[model samples]
Target: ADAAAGAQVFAANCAACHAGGNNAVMPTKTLKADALKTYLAGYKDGSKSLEEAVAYVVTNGQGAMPAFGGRLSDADIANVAAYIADQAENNKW
Candidate 1:
């Protein structure tokens, strides 16, 4: 969950689809805080933390997005989730 190390994980694994927090495949589903609050399943329902919710979707895959569960280590997923949360919540996008 280290935000600093998460940066490297994000750049390598997420930048293709989520560069700058924008969703290239789904235009309206950007990874910004507002969008996450509205669309992320458990987060929108008040059942999960932002990082946890992000990790779920990243691990399972939704729609055209592919699953990273097998490709990435648990630590990588955690780090990337933290990176995404920090960027979305902090307006780093």
Candidate 2:
């Protein structure tokens, strides 16, 4: 699924908070894609209910991260998500 694309999307969008591929300021800082997927899934499915964190960051943003819901297209989000998932599954880095 071209996890390299995921890295690209992250570099353009998520890299700010996840500095050096890690984010200590947030709830968790993860450099590895697998770790990120696990961390993100918690928020994504509402299991861990990081909805506030995820939605806030995606909609309102914080620190250096920007609200991408307006900037990124639906396809872009799907593609990036798929790319990230693939990266996590394969442990891309």
Candidate 3:
């Protein structure tokens, strides 16, 4: 899924708030697997897969996060979603 490319996309778009997978605005909602599983309830349920949840949030905006629909393309969202899911599962940097 080209997580390397996703990392670049994340650095350019999300790192301002989610640096190191930690949210500066929402301390309780980090990007770690456990955090994502708990806070992202739509994601945990069968209602939304990881990719869907990520893409929705990236495109629609959530809490203090801005929408990237205009700034990033669908490919960008998908790449970043893959990166997040992979890192969350592996718990790797």
Candidate 4:
């Protein structure tokens, strides 16, 4: 997936609630690497890759996060997850 493209997608769709990886709905579940590893379902259990986990949540939605599955294209979903993984792991957010 393309992280650069994801950055653009994120700015428009996700930045309102998750700017710089911070979660407006839930502070404990910030998109930081550790928080992601801790809160994302599959990632927390080692059943899925980091990107997959993020993509899963984005596609399916969670408690407060709305689903983007049908609204966004799959490529956009993948790209967004890639950007999240890149930022989280590299501490770029």
Pick by lDDT: which candidate is best? Answer: 4
lDDT of each: 0.91, 0.54, 0.84, 0.93
Ranking by TM-score: 4, 1, 3, 2
Candidate with better TM-score, 2 vs 3 = 3
TM-score of each: 0.95, 0.52, 0.91, 0.97
lDDT of 2 at 1: 30
Model 4 misplacement above 4 A? none
What is candidate 2's lDDT per residue for 1-93, written digit by digit as tens? 335555677677776666555675664646455455465645545554332334334545545455678887655554555554554446654
Instruction: Please list all clashing residue pairs in model 2, or write none if there are none.
Output: none
TM-score of 4: 0.97
Error of 1 at 49 (Å): 0.7
Candidate number with greatest TM-score: 4
> What's the lDDT for residue 92 in model 3?
84
Residue 21's lDDT in candidate 3? 90
**lDDT tens digits, residue span 1-93, model 4:** 788899988998999999879998898999999999888999999999998999999999999899999999999999999999899989998
Clashing pairs in 1: none
lDDT of 3 by residue, 3-31 (tens): 76788899999998999898899998988
RMSD of each: 0.8, 5.1, 1.3, 0.7
